Scaffold this active site. Structure first.
Site, short mmCIF file in Angstrom:
data_model
loop_
_atom_site.label_atom_id
_atom_site.label_comp_id
_atom_site.label_asym_id
_atom_site.label_seq_id
_atom_site.Cartn_x
_atom_site.Cartn_y
_atom_site.Cartn_z
N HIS A 41 0.80 -1.21 0.00
CA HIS A 41 0.00 0.00 0.00
C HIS A 41 0.84 1.27 0.00
CE1 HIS A 41 0.27 1.52 4.19
NE2 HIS A 41 0.40 0.25 4.53
N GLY A 140 2.99 5.36 10.58
CA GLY A 140 4.32 5.42 10.03
C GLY A 140 5.15 4.18 10.28
N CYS A 142 4.34 1.04 9.41
CA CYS A 142 4.20 -0.01 8.41
C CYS A 142 5.54 -0.32 7.77
CB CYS A 142 3.19 0.40 7.32
SG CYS A 142 1.47 0.32 7.82
#
Length: 302
Positions: A41, A140, A142
């Site tokens: 993503h 933040g 991920c």
């Protein structure tokens, strides 16, 4: 003596953690050989059908990868499950001897929690039966990886993707396969609750005996529950079926306590207790894998 949650040392991982920015989206990646892995993503918030088209519409220059301030140039794009694989123009000289491995249910691994491509903190998690973790992740984070360190090298098992209702966290392995029945989409995902890991609880009980806390076993006349008997009880009380582990041979050798006594104790303590603490707790702790306990205990036969 003493029992703590042990995080694997992070030096090898810190030399592979990078930042990946594509648009407004900011997250973390993993630099190994001449490619970077990060959650898909990074391309944006899309649906299963759209991921291929988003990757097709992308430009290699729109991805900005930084390792401690140095830019890494992307020379190729690819989708690997829920991950994006970005070939880069420089080979990571800090790439360790590593393997991509799938964490199994009950295993511990260490989370290198990262923001802006910089590891800010480490902690241990336990893979639950429903494929989720009880982590600590803010916006933040991920692309933060979970890893183990063995005498054979680094073992990358996890990359973080998402948060689920109830402070539950989900992710993929480094092949982009999700660990649980969830997906990287802004959708309400209610997932089956996780039974308590009986194998891990046995390890924790042994760790208590290793540290002179044996009231639950020595205080009673020897009480025993067969593996077959215990598995039937656990099936209907929210506990996993007992799974053996080689470490239990070491633990019973050092303590004299058999697995069957521990299983009986689990049934006796399943609802909690108040007689006395066990390693500071009054409820069974299922978060310690046998490996984690064994690295904090000594063999006594040899």
């Amino acid at each position: 003596a003493g029992i703590k949650k042990m995080v694997a040392p992070s030096s090898a991982v810190e030399q592979c953690v990078v930042s990946v920015v594509h648009g407004n989206t900011q997250l973390n990646g993993l630099w190994l050989n001449d490619y970077v892995l990060c959650p898909r993503h990074i391309l944006g918030k899309y649906t299963g059908e759209q991921w291929r088209d988003a990757l097709i519409n992308a430009n290699n220059f729109d991805f900005h990868i930084l390792y401690k301030g140095m830019e890494l140039q992307v020379v190729g794009r690819e989708l690997v499950g829920a991950l994006l694989k970005l070939k880069v123009s420089m080979v990571n000289a800090n790439t360790p001897k590593y393997k991509f491995a799938k964490a199994r249910i009950g295993d511990n691994f260490s989370i290198a929690c990262a923001y802006n491509g910089h590891v800010s903190g480490l902690y241990t998690v336990t893979l639950r039966e429903n494929g989720t973790l009880k982590g600590s992740f803010m916006s933040g984070s991920c692309g933060s990886v979970g890893y183990n360190v063995t005498n054979e090298g680094v073992e990358f098992v996890y990359m973080h993707h998402l948060e689920l209702p109830g402070c539950v966290h989900g992710g993929s392995d480094l092949h982009g396969i999700f660990y649980g029945g969830y997906v990287d989409e802004e959708v309400l995902q209610r997932i089956p609750p996780a039974p308590a890991n009986s194998r891990n609880i046995v390890a924790w009980l042994y760790a208590a005996v290793y540290n002179n806390c044996d009231w639950f076993v020595k205080y009673g006349p020897k009480q025993v529950m067969s593996v077959e008997d215990f598995n039937e009880w656990a099936s209907g009380y929210g506990f996993t079926k007992f799974e053996y582990h080689l470490a239990f041979d070491v633990f019973s050798a050092a303590t004299g306590v058999s697995v069957e006594q521990m299983l009986a104790a689990i049934k006796e303590l399943a609802d909690g207790w108040n007689y006395a603490p066990v390693l500071g707790s009054f409820h069974l702790d299922d978060e310690y894998s046998p490996e984690m306990i064994m690295q904090q205990t000594s063999g006594i036969v040899l």
